PDB file of C-alpha atoms in Angstrom:
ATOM      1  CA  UNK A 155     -28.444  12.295 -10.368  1.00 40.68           C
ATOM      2  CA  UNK A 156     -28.537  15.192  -7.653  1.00 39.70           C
ATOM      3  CA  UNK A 157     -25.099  15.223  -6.863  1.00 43.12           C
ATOM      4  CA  UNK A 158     -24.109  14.745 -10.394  1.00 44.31           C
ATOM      5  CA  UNK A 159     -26.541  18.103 -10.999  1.00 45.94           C
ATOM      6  CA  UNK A 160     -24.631  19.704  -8.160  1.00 46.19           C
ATOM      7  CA  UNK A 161     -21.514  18.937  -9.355  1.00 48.94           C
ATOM      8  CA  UNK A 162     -21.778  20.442 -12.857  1.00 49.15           C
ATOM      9  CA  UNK A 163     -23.005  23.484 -10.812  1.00 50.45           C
ATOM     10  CA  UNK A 164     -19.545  24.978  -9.868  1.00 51.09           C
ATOM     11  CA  UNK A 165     -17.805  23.747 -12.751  1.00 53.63           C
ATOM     12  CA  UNK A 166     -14.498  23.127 -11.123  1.00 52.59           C
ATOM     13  CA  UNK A 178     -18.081  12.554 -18.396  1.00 52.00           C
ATOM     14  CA  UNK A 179     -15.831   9.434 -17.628  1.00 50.98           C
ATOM     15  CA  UNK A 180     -13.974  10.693 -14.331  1.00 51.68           C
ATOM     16  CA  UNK A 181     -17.319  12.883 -13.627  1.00 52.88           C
ATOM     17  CA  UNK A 182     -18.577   9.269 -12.957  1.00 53.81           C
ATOM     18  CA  UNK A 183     -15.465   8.064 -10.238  1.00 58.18           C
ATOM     19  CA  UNK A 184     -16.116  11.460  -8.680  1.00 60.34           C
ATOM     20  CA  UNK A 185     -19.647  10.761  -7.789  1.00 63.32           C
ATOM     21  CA  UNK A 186     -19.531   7.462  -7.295  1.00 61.36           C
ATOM     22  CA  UNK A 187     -16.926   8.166  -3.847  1.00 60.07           C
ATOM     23  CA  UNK A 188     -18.728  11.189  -2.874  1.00 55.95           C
ATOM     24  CA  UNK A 189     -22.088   9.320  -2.280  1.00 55.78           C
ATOM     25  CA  UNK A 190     -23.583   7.289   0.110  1.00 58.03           C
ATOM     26  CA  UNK A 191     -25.777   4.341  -1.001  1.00 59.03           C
ATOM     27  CA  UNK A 192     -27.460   1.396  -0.094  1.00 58.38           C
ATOM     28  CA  UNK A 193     -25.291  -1.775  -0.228  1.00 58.57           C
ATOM     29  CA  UNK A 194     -26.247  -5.203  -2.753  1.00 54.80           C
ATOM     30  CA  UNK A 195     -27.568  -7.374   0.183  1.00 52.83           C
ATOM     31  CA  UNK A 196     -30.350  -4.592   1.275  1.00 54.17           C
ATOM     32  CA  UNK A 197     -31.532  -4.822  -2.391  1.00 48.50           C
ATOM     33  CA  UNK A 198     -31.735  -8.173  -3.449  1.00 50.02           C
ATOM     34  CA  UNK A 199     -34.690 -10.746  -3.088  1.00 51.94           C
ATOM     35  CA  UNK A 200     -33.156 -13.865  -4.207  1.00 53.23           C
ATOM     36  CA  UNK A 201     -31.810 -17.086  -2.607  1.00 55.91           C
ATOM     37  CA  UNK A 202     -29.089 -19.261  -4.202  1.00 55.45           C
ATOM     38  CA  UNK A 203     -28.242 -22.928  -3.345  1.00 57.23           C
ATOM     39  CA  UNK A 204     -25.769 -25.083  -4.661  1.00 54.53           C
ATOM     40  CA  UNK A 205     -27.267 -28.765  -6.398  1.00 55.01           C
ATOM     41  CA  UNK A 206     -24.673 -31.885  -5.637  1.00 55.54           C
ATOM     42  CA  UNK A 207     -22.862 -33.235  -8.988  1.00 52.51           C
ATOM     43  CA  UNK A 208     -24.797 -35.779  -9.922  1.00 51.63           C
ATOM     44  CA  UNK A 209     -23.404 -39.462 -10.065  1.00 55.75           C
ATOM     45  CA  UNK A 210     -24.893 -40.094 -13.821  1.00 55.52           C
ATOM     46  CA  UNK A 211     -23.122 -37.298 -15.423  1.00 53.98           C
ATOM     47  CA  UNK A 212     -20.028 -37.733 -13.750  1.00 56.66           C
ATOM     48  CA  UNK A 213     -19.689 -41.319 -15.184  1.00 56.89           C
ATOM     49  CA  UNK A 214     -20.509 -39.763 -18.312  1.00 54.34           C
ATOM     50  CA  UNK A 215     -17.369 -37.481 -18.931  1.00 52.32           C
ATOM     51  CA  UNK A 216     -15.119 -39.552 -16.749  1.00 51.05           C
ATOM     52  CA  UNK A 217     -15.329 -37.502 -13.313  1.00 45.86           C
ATOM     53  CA  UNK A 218     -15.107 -38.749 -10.237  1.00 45.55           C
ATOM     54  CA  UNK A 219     -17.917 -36.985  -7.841  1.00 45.81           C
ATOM     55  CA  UNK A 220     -17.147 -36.510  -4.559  1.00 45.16           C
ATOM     56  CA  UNK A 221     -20.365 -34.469  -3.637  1.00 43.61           C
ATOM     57  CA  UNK A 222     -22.975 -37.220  -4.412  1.00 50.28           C
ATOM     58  CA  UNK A 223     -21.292 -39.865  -2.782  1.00 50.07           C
ATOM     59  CA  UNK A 224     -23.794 -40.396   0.450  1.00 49.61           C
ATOM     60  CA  UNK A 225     -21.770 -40.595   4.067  1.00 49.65           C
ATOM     61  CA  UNK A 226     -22.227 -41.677   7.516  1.00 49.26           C
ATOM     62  CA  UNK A 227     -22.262 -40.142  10.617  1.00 48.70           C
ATOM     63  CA  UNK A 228     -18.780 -41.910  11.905  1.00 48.61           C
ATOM     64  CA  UNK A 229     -17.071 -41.172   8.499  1.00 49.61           C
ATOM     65  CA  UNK A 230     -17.251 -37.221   8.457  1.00 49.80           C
ATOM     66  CA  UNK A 231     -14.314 -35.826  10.364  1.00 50.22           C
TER      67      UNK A 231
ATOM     68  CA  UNK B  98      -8.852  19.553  -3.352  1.00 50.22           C
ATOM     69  CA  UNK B  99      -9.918  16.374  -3.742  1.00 50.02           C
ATOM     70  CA  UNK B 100     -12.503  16.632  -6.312  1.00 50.60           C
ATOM     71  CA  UNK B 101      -9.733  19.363  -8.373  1.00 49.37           C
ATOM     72  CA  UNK B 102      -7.405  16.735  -7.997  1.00 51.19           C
ATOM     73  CA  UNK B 103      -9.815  13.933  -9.766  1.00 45.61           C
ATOM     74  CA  UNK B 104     -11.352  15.764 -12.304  1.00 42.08           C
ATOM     75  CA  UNK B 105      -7.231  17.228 -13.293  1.00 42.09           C
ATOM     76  CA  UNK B 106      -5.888  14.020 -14.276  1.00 44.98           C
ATOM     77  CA  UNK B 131      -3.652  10.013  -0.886  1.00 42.55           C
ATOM     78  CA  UNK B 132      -3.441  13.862   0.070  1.00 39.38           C
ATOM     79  CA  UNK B 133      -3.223  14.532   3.487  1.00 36.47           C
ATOM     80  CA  UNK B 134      -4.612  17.534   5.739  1.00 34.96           C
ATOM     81  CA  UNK B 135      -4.385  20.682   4.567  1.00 35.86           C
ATOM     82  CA  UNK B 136      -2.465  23.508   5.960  1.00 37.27           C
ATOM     83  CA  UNK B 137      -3.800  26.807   6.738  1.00 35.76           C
ATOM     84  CA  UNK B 138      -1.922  29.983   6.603  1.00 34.93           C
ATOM     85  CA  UNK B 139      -3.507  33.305   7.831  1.00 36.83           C
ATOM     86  CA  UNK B 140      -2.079  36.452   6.770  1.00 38.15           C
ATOM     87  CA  UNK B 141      -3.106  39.715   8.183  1.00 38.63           C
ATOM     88  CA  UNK B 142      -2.743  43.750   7.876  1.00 38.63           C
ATOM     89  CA  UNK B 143      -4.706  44.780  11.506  1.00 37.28           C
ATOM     90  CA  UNK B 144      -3.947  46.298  14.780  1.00 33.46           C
ATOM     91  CA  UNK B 145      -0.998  45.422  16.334  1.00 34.77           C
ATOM     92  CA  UNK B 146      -0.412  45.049  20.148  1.00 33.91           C
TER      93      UNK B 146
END
């Protein structure tokens, strides 16, 4: 808002937007957020449902991950 | 020059040019 303020002040509303937007500095997405996101394996019951063939639920050993 | 440029519509440094009417040695 200030710089857009400024801005209008010497008078050299879409490209008034791209203009401010470069000529700022601001705080990045990560040093916002508060969220965590995980990923849930396909499960083997739906994927004998629709004919898929789930690669993620299918349990492993130590030996057989290479 | 580069907010004239984006509000009219990869510039590099700009050259300046001094002209002057003063004492002479």
């Amino acid at each position: 808002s200030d710089r857009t303020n400024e801005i209008r002040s010497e008078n050299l509303n879409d490209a008034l937007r791209e203009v401010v937007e470069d000529e700022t500095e601001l705080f990045p997405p990560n040093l916002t957020r508060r969220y965590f996101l995980y990923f849930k394996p396909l499960s083997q019951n739906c994927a004998r449902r629709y004919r898929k063939k789930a690669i993620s639920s299918k349990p492993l050993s130590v030996r057989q991950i290479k | 020059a580069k907010r004239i440029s984006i509000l009219s519509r990869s510039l590099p440094t700009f050259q300046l040019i001094l002209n002057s009417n003063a004492n002479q040695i």
